[PDB]
Every structure is written in C-alpha cells, then in structure tokens.
C-alpha cells in the first residue's frame, strides 16, 4: 500500500489544465494577429497559423484526451486507440509545418527573383491541406491494424471490471512500442528533424557566401581603383579597369534585392564611366584615363555604397529571421525527445526496469508545454508580431 493515487493525479490534472489554458490563449493571439495585420499575411505565416492551430487543438482536445487515458478507464479498444493516438496527428502536423517553413526560407534566400512566382498562397494552402491528411494517416496508423487490441491484458481487464470487447485504456497496452520507436520516432520525427537541421545549415551557408561575394566585389572595386592611381602604364590601367568592370557587372546582377530605378541609374553611371576610361586606355591616354577613373569615386560614394549597405542589411535580416524560426525547431525537439528516448529504453532494454510513473508524466507534461512557447518566441524575436500583439492587447483587452 502507498499514497492514494488521487493525490498525484490531482497534481497532474491541474498542471495539464494550466497548460491547456495558456496554449489556447497564446495561439489564439497568433491567429488573431495574422488575420489583423496584412504585413503578417504571407506564405511563411500560413504555416505559422497551421502550426498555431495544431497547438490550439492540443489544449482543446489532446490534453483532455491525455487526462482521460491516465485513468485507465474501460473502453472499446479502437475507441481507446483514437484517444491514445490523436496527439500523434497534431505532432506530425507540427513537423510538416516546421519543415515547410524551413524550405520556404531556403527558397527565399536561394532564388529570390523566382520566389513569388513559385511559392504562392494557393499552392501553400494546398500543401497545408495535403499535410493535414497525411498527418491523420500517419498518426492513426495503429487503428489500421498495427495495435495490441488482439493481445489484451486480461489481468488488468478483469481487475478494472471491463465488459466484453473492452480493454483498460492504457497507452503502453494498446499502442505497440515498435510502431512508436521505428515508425513514429525514427521515420516520422527523427528523419524530418535532421532534414530541417540540414536545410537551415544550407540557409546560413548561402547567406555567409552571398555576404562574402558582396564584400569581395566591393574591395575589388577599391583595389583596382587605388591601382589606377599608381601605374604609369596605359595597359596596366586598362588591366585594372577590366577586372573592375567584371566586379561591377557582377555586383549589379548579384543583388536586385519596376521600382529600383536608382540601382540601374547608379550602376549605369558606373559601368558607363568605366567604359569611358577604357576607350582612353586603349588609345594610350594614360593620364586622361587616370583622371576619368577618379570620377568613379563619386558614383561609388553616391550610389554603389548605398546598394551594398541595403543588400547587406537585407541578408542580415534574413539570417536573424531564420535564426528565430530555428529556435522554434530546437524547442520542439527539446520538449519531445525525452518521451521518445524513454520509449527507446522501454523497447530496447528489456533488462532495464521501466521508467517510474512520475517521470513518464513529467515527459508527457513537458511535451504539452511546447504548445505554449511559440507565441513567446514570436513576441520576443519578430517585431511585426510584437507590435501587433500590443495593438490587440491594449485595444481589445485594456
């Protein structure tokens, strides 16, 4: 005999209900902000809303299901399976939304000119609907036959006094552990997580490479410039002008990120001034070419230096934003890996004693807290969400 089980159950139920309240309120706020602000109405945030909708359903459905199944109540085994497995649908939907966000940010930084013609809202909405259908198929797969309903625990069934066709509804009695470990964890969770890690790695490498190319063109522009002011040879000045023209056409085609009329004007003055200094160089007028090339220092100061700064800050904002979204993925893995790792010990080590009950429910509670944290990450790291949060709160609550 030990402590009455209702005492520890009261702690678990209260904590679960506290999580459900916060998960609903915070993610309702996220959906409200995107509905309200057109600046937040882009393809990237449609998956953020699909992700927020999954977390609302954790508080509205998954946590009540979790409280129910903790009692071990008698139920038809396939009704028990739906109660046990529905949270796997919502978690799989979250993985699809996170994977789509990473790929979306990869397309945006790799092919900026082709982004809006390739990634549209209509295609995004279709991708979201397909991912929700696949999430139900993956998460509810044990209902298709991969379950332990055919091997019921008759000791627990008779102890709790279940009827005919009923089982004591406990998670590890109806859901097989080889599904949870091989199918759910390895194939459906671990593999997509590693792919997300690789995509974001490709995002950060692409940004670092584009910034280096921008810096390379810039110092190449100034290096040949100081070289022209030195060489007493006309061909030596022509050499610098040619390696100066390539870096000009390079940086021009490098960063367009019509309305950018200055970018064409500022670069047409530059390339046109270089071509002028070239015709002087070919005709042997060395000091006339050196004097013409000194005009570049004005076009550079009045146009080219302004495009480099605007291009660098655009890439730094993309890095900061992809860093914000990668935190979402890291907090997801942090909240869900303990449960998966416990299942591995249960499955792979039959000589190990089972993890204690209090640790099992701490891992369950921890996985539910993930449906609370994302709105905080948005509020702290994305200014457009933070500002829209204030407007909603100050005006409609206060």
Ligand X SMILES: CCCCCCCC/C=C\CCCCCCCC(=O)OC[C@H](O)CO
Ligand Y SMILES: Nc1nc(NCCc2ccc(O)cc2)nc2nc(-c3ccco3)nn12
Residues at the contact surface with ligand X, assessed by CB under 6 A: 5, 8-9, 11-12, 15, 31, 34-35, 41, 46, 49-50, 53, 56-57, 60-61, 64, 67-68, 70-71, 73-74, 76, 78-79, 125, 128, 132-133, 137, 143-144, 357-358, 361-362, 365
Scanning the chain, the segments in alpha helix (DSSP H) are: 5-36, 43-57, 63-70, 77-110, 115-118, 121-139, 154-159, 171-174, 177-178, 191-228, 234-254, 261-282, 286-293, 296-299, 305-348, 357-381, 383-392
Out of ligand X, ligand Y, Na ion, none, what residue 172 binds, judged by CB under 5 to 8 A for its kind, is ligand Y
Q: Closest separation between CB of residue 265 and ligand CLR, Å?
A: 52
Long-range pairs for 32-41 at CB < 8 Å and ≥24 separation?
Answer: 32/392, 33/385, 33/388, 33/389, 33/392, 36/388, 36/391, 36/392, 37/384, 37/388, 39/384, 40/384, 40/385, 40/388
Which of 195, 225, 327, 342 forms a contact with ligand CLR (CB under 6 A)?
Answer: 342
Q: CB of 68: closest distance to ligand CLR in angstroms?
A: 8
Least distance (Å) between residue 372 CB and Na ion: 10
Closest approach, Cβ 181 to ligand CLR, in A, equals 9
Task: Choose from Na ion, ligand CLR, ligand OLA, none: what does 338 bind? Cβ within 5-8 Å by kind.
Answer: ligand CLR
Q: Report which of 164, 172, 166, 182 is spatially closest to residue 147, judged by C-alpha positions.
A: 172
Question: Parallel, antiparallel, or unpaired: how do β-strands 74-76 and 166-168 relate?
Answer: antiparallel
Buried b (16+ CB within 10 A) or exposed e, 271-282: eebbeebbebbe
Q: Which stretch binds ligand CLR (CB under 6 A): 12-20, 142-150, 202-210, 334-342?
A: 334-342
As given in the structure block, the two tokens for residue 259 are 């309305």
User: Counting contacts by CB under 6 A, is residue 47 touching ligand Y?
Assistant: no
Q: Which residue's Cβ has the minimum distance to ligand X? A: 8
H-only helix segments in 146-190: 154-159, 171-174, 177-178
Angstrom CA distances, 391 to 22, 28, 384, 395, stand at 20, 15, 11, 6
CB 84 within 8 A of CB 169: yes
Which of the listed partners (ligand X, Na ion, ligand OLA, none) does 70 bind, with a CB threshold of 5 to 8 Å by partner kind? ligand X
Q: Does 94 bind Na ion (CB under 5 A)?
A: yes
CA separation, residue 14 to residues 68, 71, 218, 278, 307 (Å): 13, 15, 61, 79, 56
Count the residues of the shown chain that bind Na ion, applying the rule CB under 5 A. 3
Task: Report the residue from 27, 92, 93, 343 that binds ligand Y according to the rule CB under 6 A.
Answer: 343
Query: Measuring CA to CA, which residue among 334, 340, 343 is closest to residue 366?
Result: 334
Among 18, 31, 67, 76, binds ligand CLR (CB under 6 A): 76
Question: Nearest approach, Cβ of 364 to ligand Y (angstroms)?
Answer: 6
From 10-18, 40-48, 314-322, 389-397, span contacting ligand OLA (CB under 6 A): 10-18
**Does 67 engage in binding with ligand OLA (CB under 6 A)?**
yes
* Residue 331 contacts ligand OLA per CB under 6 A: yes
Stretch that binds ligand CLR, among 230-238, 270-278, 302-310, 335-343 (CB under 6 A): 335-343
Residues 157-186 close enough to bind ligand Y by CB under 6 A: 170-172, 180
Residue 190: exposure state from Cβ atoms within 10 A (0-12, 13-18, ≥19): middle
List of residues 6+ apart from 227 with CB closer than 8 A? 236, 240
Size of the site for ligand OLA (CB under 6 A): 31
Among 19, 48, 52, 56, contact with ligand OLA (rule: CB under 6 A): 56
How far apart are alpha carbons 122 and 141 in whole angstroms?
29
Residue least distant from ligand Y (Cβ): 171
Give the binding range for ligand OLA (CB under 6 A) out of 224-232, 254-262, 353-361, 390-398. Answer: 353-361
Provide the CB-side half-sphere exposure for 101 (13 A, CA). Answer: 25
Using the rule CB under 6 A, is 13 a contact of ligand Y? no
Structure tokens at 71: 């009692």
Question: Residues interacting with ligand OLA, by CB under 6 A?
Answer: 8, 11, 13, 15, 17, 28, 31-32, 35, 56, 60, 67, 129-130, 132-134, 136-137, 140, 143, 327, 330-331, 333-334, 337, 356, 358-359, 362
Question: Residues interacting with ligand Y, by CB under 6 A?
Answer: 170-172, 180, 339-340, 343, 357, 360, 364
């Amino acid at each position: 005999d030990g402590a009455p089980p209702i005492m520890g159950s009261s702690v678990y139920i209260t904590v679960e209900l506290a999580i459900a309240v916060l998960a609903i309120l915070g993610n309702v706020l996220v959906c409200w902000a995107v509905w309200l602000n057109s600046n937040l109405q882009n393809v990237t945030n449609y998956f953020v809303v699909s992700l927020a909708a999954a977390d609302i359903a954790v508080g509205v459905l998954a946590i009540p299901f979790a409280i129910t199944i903790s009692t071990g109540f008698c139920a038809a085994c396939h009704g028990c399976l739906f109660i046990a497995c529905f949270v796997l649908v919502l978690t799989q939907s979250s993985i699809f939304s996170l994977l789509a966000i990473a790929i979306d940010r990869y397309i945006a930084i790799r092919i900026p000119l082709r982004y809006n013609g390739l990634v549209t809202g209509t295609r995004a909405k279709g991708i979201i609907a397909i991912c929700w259908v696949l999430s139900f198929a993956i998460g509810l797969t044990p209902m298709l036959g991969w379950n332990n309903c055919g091997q019921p625990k008759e000791g627990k069934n008779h102890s709790q006094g279940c009827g005919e066709g009923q089982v004591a509804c406990l998670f590890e009695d109806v859901v097989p552990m080889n599904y949870m470990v091989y199918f759910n964890f390895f194939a459906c969770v671990l593999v997509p997580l590693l792919l997300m890690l690789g995509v974001y790695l490709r995002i950060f490498l692409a940004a670092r490479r584009q910034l280096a190319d921008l810096e390379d063109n810039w110092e190449t522009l100034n290096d040949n410039l100081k070289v022209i002011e030195k060489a007493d040879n006309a061909a030596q000045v022509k050499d610098a002008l040619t390696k100066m023209r390539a870096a000009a056409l390079d940086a021009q085609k490098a960063t367009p990120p019509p309305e950018m009329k200055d970018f064409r004007h500022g670069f047409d003055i530059l390339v046109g001034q270089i071509d002028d200094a070239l015709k002087l160089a070919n005709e042997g007028k060395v000091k006339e070419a050196q004097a013409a090339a000194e005009q570049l220092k004005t076009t550079r100061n009045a146009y080219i230096q302004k495009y480099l700064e605007r291009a660098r800050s655009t890439l730094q904002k993309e890095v900061h934003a992809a860093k914000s979204l990668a935190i979402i993925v890291g907090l997801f893995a942090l909240c869900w890996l303990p449960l998966h790792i416990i299942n591995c010990f249960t499955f792979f080590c039959p000589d190990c004693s089972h993890a204690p009950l209090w640790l099992m429910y701490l891992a369950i509670v921890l996985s539910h807290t993930n449906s609370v944290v994302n709105p905080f990450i948005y509020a702290y790291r994305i200014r457009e969400f933070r500002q829209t949060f204030r407007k909603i709160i100050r005006s409609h609550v206060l």
